[model samples]
Target: AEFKAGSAKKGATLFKTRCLQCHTVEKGGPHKVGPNLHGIFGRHSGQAEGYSYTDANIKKNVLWDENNMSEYLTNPKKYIPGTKMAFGGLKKEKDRNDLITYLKKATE
Candidate 1:
């Protein structure tokens, strides 16, 4: 229901503007400062093969799904207390909707 409210078209723009600096969405994409987001849908939190993750993240492992993804994106640090990701989370529900929607399609 939440993802249905978003626009993947708009999400692409948001990804470029907000997330591209640290991440990449394409399949087989290289790991940037953050891991490539492809295949993240069914993946565990700190499971990306090549990119190293913070201890807190691997320890806070959770399966990625729409509901939790929404919460996690709303505040990365808050969701996982000891995570090292530096960016502030998306505070706008609409922005999170779009970004998560984008991740659904792009990561698949």
Candidate 2:
């Protein structure tokens, strides 16, 4: 599927409201409850600096691909038994897709 630029913009707004508290994508944002998401998409789990990861996530060594991200965003606990992310996954497929688009754009 082609990347949706419009959805990514929408996802950016949603992310700032719902996800900025714990995650940061900017160069110097502080890490609070989660890792800085400067380059999260396609990044391997537990690779972010200064942020500690759960054993389950480390053991998985999973790379954040489109398929894994889609599934993970639907149900984090189901995807990873002991992930530190507290937000229950994005319930809507559109939201997940938008978020993924946003991440891809930001990371790229």
lDDT at 71 for candidate 2?
Answer: 82
Clashing pairs in 1: none
What are the lDDT figures for the candidates, one per model? 0.85, 0.77
lDDT of 2 by residue, 1-108 (tens): 223344888888878777777887876667878888777777898888888888988888888877687787788888889886768877777887788778777756
How far off is residue 32 in model 2, in Å?
1.7
Best by TM-score: 1
User: Per-prediction count of colliding residue pairs?
Assistant: 0, 0
Clashing pairs in 2: none
TM-score of 1: 0.92
Q: What local lDDT score does residue 97 receive in model 2, on the 0 to 100 scale?
A: 76
Q: Model 2: runs farther than 4 Å from truth? A: 1-6
Candidate 2, lDDT over the whole model: 0.77
